[PDB]
Design a protein around this ligand. Structure first.
Ligand SMILES: [Zn+2]
Ligand SMILES: [Zn+2]
Lengths: 135, 246, 113, 194, 101, 42, 97, 149
């Protein structure tokens, strides 16, 4: 099973490949550099991009040296580009942030700092269990 | 009475359900299989309500309550509140609270007598918990985790906690709660106990990946079935537990 | 559904109107329009911007101490549905609106004596 | 022959929850280059002889321009037949609350505050269609029955409206009725002046 | 003089809010969480010289003392004395309230 | 993925048309024709 | 030689030519197929596009994520005064149509 | 004792309260009288999944969320509950003791009307105001002449 989740409604994708997002867990990483987005299609010249609830592949640019040598799966939990929900609300967070997971969606860390989006919480039950605030 | 189940092929039952001694809440899904599991176990003894919280389906982690009351976060809509009030009888008090840490199922774990909360909850939130749930409230952590509702399942009979909880912490927490506590896992070695299961005084529902030794541990600590007690863990089931979890 | 109010200016915020800012401490800020949202992003004070209900209440140009303003609140303890209660709530709602309009006119004339 | 010289209303032809087709001419755009007419990629900055162009309209035989190559020309004002549009409401003109619902008890009509922009007021029967239609304001619309029996559950769904927006579309309208605007605003200077 | 005034209003250039600063002044725990979201080795002056009112880090104690004499610091002090705009004041402006029973 | 022109998709759509959507559209047609007949005879 | 990276062609050739429509009023190219067993009914109607607005729908779509929830949707208003029937045209079938 | 072995003793350790007290349990009496559900039993309890299978299957069956509502009158169970009225939230005004507060408001209104709270109230002043308006018009005309020249 590839990591792109099913049942996700269309939303604005705010984070293309090459974005540096914050790390919202206590895994030791401080930021995540996006190199790929799970489930991205094929289009000439188009940068693959992701939104809240999407799985990306990321490298650690700042944090513990043991995490700097690997490409980790991560789930985007916060984005700053405004997007619309099906209830009509356009909303955005004050930062871009994700959490490191395995391909099965279970979290590498043990705590999440700050809130997570409803899309990420509903698509990933471990993030829902580790979320303090869901907005 | 420990039953393995799945919500849309997910083993995280406590993420999608809330079980007390007077009501059950289940997430509204695309089918009725998850509702039918709880309906087969509880044949109209307590009400079961198909709930939505803030437009989401993670209701076990968004809600917290016991046999006396129910607490929902500030993002619960008036129509969801009305549906919950119309489904539950008047013996249960329902309150929407303005707590900043709105994942109430993660920050609150409670039986009918006591509650453990995230240490950074508001004093007004603690007072509302003590009033509506009719319990004594303590601020606690389980193995340095502040999400007590996701890292412990609790009943009036006993409690199951994080596997990496030290013996001294188990003893202190067992003194504080007044119930026997056991450190164990669910869902083939997961430490997210509250996200992995729901329990009340006579029924537990765990995920389908929960293996037979940890299922027997759950039955022993929560006294489910005839002749079930926590003494079987260190007398009758000790060899099985050592062999499985060494 | 329900009618919200703008955090910045206090206007009614109907569904699909405006934008919501989700802050990392756990607080949501609903704005009815881009004007209020952009003033918020520029960190202007609604209490100092004269076109806001915040300024008007701070200056004393809104009727605040009145018995007709005690009937609307965020109800955190739900009530079991009752058809007669809902119908009489609608009738009381209309009566309260009329009485509030009369008292507001009296308040404005007392201001403009 | 029995229908000769008689008026036929819309609700004797179509029904709420029916999926129909809409036929109209699209919005005119005039003469438009290839970038907006066909969606081609812009050439890099300060490209000689222009960058809103196709670089090679022919590199291969025949010694001709082919009919499949994007060219600048008329965009819009095209005849389009769009299908599968759900009818949400058939409101009656003589109904003074034809924009009211069962949960929104405000007695109000479909016309927004200040009127429909560049149209006026809707005083007759109206059809409320989910989504968008090929035409513009004031334009003749031809509503057609669907050519085939439908295959989706969306055509079988019945629509329950909780609320219809009647605020001003001439700006950021926050009030559904003039009474609501007056009640929020309070007494003005001209109210005491009158 | 604002650095890069064109993109001052972008979300990626957002500064800390006045109500958050008020909560930092009232409760040291909330300030502790805000400082936990930072890294002290990357901070100016190793995070030792911090003005809570301006939510700002400085390279030295002399720099912090000199900043306290400036008008931005006094403007922040005047804003904090007047008080920060909050959701409770937004509720009171329209005459709404919360009924908890 | 099966195309929109696939024979199995066409057969499934034909069964849906015959068994599900057909009676609903027939009842709606009956109501609309009754109303327009009332207009025609009035 | 061959194109190095594949890409689908810009625009559809089904809507050619991209010229102005020959008439301002839309033309019903095809009517629904006639069934003599059905009762008589009109197949079309006319109206005038007035504008767009916003609704809130209580959605009943079993299987969807927004099932039993409120959804905000855009709608189009078409002003429809009643028409007046003024004529009758008969059509025969010929080998030329 | 090694770390793995210590973790195993942590897993088999059963913590108990030191005072020996047990919490009171709340198990309803009908649980003992319940008959266990069996799929092979021809007289088993009909489930919601059985009703769903009989009524079109998953993704087609439409569950009735109001079927298990416990209201004072069962005829009210399928009402359209009012939510919006004249730009106000009905749920904001829902209050069990609404009639007493409305009675107090009406008594206050009668008292204010008796006391003259809503009551409403010179040709020389009108004449001098008109003369001042004429003077202001003359000043505007003079200023317009100056602007022209
Ligand atoms: Zn506003
Ligand atoms: Zn300072």
């Amino acid at each position: 099973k590839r990591g792109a989740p099913g049942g996700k409604l269309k939303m604005t994708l705010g984070l293309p490949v090459g974005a540096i997002m914050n790390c919202a867990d206590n895994s030791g990483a401080r930021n995540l550099y996006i190199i790929a987005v799970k489930g991205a299609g094929a289009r000439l010249n188009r940068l693959p991009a992701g939104g809240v609830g999407d799985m990306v592949m990321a490298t650690v640019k700042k944090g513990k040296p043991e995490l700097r040598k690997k490409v980790h799966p991560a789930v985007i939990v916060r984005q700053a580009k405004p997007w619309k929900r099906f209830d009509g609300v356009f909303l955005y967070f004050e930062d871009n942030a994700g959490v490191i997971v395995n391909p099965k969606g279970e979290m590498k860390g043990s705590a999440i700092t700050g809130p997570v989006g409803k899309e990420a919480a509903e698509l990933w039950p471990r993030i829902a269990s580790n979320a303090g605030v869901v907005m | 009475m420990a039953v393995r189940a799945q919500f849309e092929n997910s083993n995280e039952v406590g993420v999608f359900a809330t079980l007390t001694n007077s009501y059950c809440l289940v997430a509204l899904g695309a089918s009725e299989n998850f509702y039918s599991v709880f309906e087969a176990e509880l044949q109209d003894v307590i009400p079961i309500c198909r709930t939505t919280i803030a437009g989401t389906r993670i209701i076990g982690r968004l809600t917290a309550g016991n046999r006396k009351g129910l607490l929902v976060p500030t993002t619960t809509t008036d129509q969801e509140l009305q549906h919950l009030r119309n489904s539950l009888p008047d013996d249960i008090r329902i309150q929407r609270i303005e707590e900043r840490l709105s994942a109430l199922g993660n920050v609150i774990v409670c039986n009918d007598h006591t509650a453990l909360i995230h240490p950074d909850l508001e004093r007004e939130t603690e007072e509302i918990i003590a009033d509506v749930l009719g319990v004594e409230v303590f601020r606690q952590t389980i193995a340095d985790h502040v999400l007590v509702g996701s890292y412990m399942a609790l009943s009036n009979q006993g409690g199951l906690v994080h596997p990496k909880t030290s013996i001294q912490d188990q003893d202190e927490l067992s003194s504080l709660l007044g119930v026997p506590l056991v450190a164990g896992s669910v869902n083939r070695g997961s430490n997210v106990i509250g996200g992995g299961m729901v329990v009340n005084d006579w029924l537990a529902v765990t995920g389908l990946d929960t293996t037979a030794p940890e299922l027997s541990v759950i039955e022993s600590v929560f006294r489910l079935g005839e002749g079930a007690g926590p003494g079987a863990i260190n007398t009758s089931m000790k060899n099985t537990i050592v062999e499985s979890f060494y | 559904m329900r009618i919200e109010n703008c955090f910045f200016c206090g206007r009614p915020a109907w569904p699909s109107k405006g934008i919501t800012f989700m802050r990392n401490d756990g607080k949501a800020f609903r704005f009815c329009r881009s004007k209020c949202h952009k003033n918020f992003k520029m960190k202007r004070n609604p209490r100092k911007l004269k076109w806001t209900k915040a300024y008007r209440k701070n200056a004393g140009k809104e009727m605040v101490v009145d018995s007709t303003l005690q009937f609307a609140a965020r109800r955190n303890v739900p009530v079991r549905y009752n058809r007669e209660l809902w119908q009489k709530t609608l009738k009381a709602m209309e009566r309260i609106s009329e009485i509030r309009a009369r008292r507001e006119r009296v308040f404005y004339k007392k201001r403009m004596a | 022959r029995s229908l000769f010289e008689k008026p036929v209303t819309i609700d004797t032809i179509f029904e709420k929850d029916e999926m129909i087709d809409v036929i109209a001419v699209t919005k005119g755009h005039g003469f438009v280059g290839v970038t907006a007419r066909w969606g081609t990629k812009k050439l890099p900055r300060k490209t000689h002889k222009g960058l809103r162009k196709v670089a090679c309209i022919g590199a291969w035989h025949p010694s001709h321009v082919q009919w499949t190559v994007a060219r600048a020309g008329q965009m819009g004002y095209h005849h389009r037949t769009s299908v599968n549009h759900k009818i949400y409401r058939i409101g009656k003109g003589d109904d003074e609350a034809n924009a009211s619902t069962e949960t929104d008890l405000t007695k109000k009509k479909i016309t927004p505050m200040g009127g429909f922009v560049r149209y006026g007021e809707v005083n007759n029967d109206y059809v409320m269609i989910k989504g968008s239609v090929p035409g513009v304001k004031k334009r003749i619309m031809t509503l057609r029955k669907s050519l085939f029996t439908h295959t989706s559950r969306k055509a079988l769904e019945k629509v329950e409206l909780k609320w219809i927006d009647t605020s001003s579309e001439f700006g950021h309208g926050a009030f559904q009725t003039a009474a609501e605007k007056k009640q929020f605003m309070g007494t003005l200077k001209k109210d005491l002046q009158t | 003089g604002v650095f890069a005034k064109r993109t001052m209003t972008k979300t990626r250039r957002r500064l800390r809010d006045l109500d958050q600063i008020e909560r930092d002044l009232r409760s040291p725990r909330h300030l502790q969480q805000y400082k936990e979201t930072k890294a002290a080795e990357d901070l100016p002056g190793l995070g030792l010289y911090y003005c809570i009112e301006c939510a700002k880090w400085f390279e030295s104690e002399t720099s912090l003392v000199g900043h306290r004499k400036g008008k931005p610091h006094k403007r922040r002090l005047k804003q904090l004395k007047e008080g920060a705009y909050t959701h409770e004041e937004a509720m009171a402006a329209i005459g709404y309230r919360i009924d908890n029973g | 993925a099966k195309s929109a022109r696939a024979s199995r998709i066409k057969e499934n759509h034909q069964r849906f048309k015959k068994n599900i959507a057909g009676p609903v559209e027939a009842a709606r047609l009956e109501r609309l024709s009754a109303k327009l007949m009332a207009i025609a005879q009035a | 030689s061959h194109r190095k990276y594949e890409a689908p062609r810009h625009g559809s050739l089904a809507f050619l030519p991209r010229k102005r429509a020959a008439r301002h009023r839309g033309r019903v190219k095809s009517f629904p197929k006639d069934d003599p067993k059905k009762p008589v009914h009109l197949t079309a109607a006319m109206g005038y596009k007035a504008g767009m607005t916003t609704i809130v729908r209580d959605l009943d779509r079993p299987g969807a994520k927004a099932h039993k929830k409120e959804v905000v949707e855009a709608v189009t208003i078409i002003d429809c005064p009643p028409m007046v029937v003024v004529g009758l045209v008969g059509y025969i079938e010929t080998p030329r149509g | 004792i090694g770390t793995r072995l210590q973790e195993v003793m942590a897993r088999i350790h059963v913590a108990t309260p030191m005072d020996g007290t047990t919490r009171e349990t709340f198990i309803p009496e009908a649980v003992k009288n319940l008959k266990k559900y069996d799929k092979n039993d021809p007289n088993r309890r009909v489930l919601a999944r059985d009703i769903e299978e009989a009524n079109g299957g998953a993704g087609v069956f439409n569950v009735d969320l109001r079927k298990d509502w416990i209201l004072e009158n069962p005829e009210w169970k399928y009402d359209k509950i009012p939510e919006i009225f004249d730009g106000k939230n009905v749920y904001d005004y829902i209050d069990p003791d609404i009639d007493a507060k409305l009675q107090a408001l009406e008594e206050e209104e009668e008292r204010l009307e008796k006391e003259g709270f809503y009551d409403e109230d010179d040709e020389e002043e009108e004449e001098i105001l008109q003369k001042a308006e004429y003077i202001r018009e003359q000043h505007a005309l003079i200023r317009n002449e100056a602007k022209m020249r």
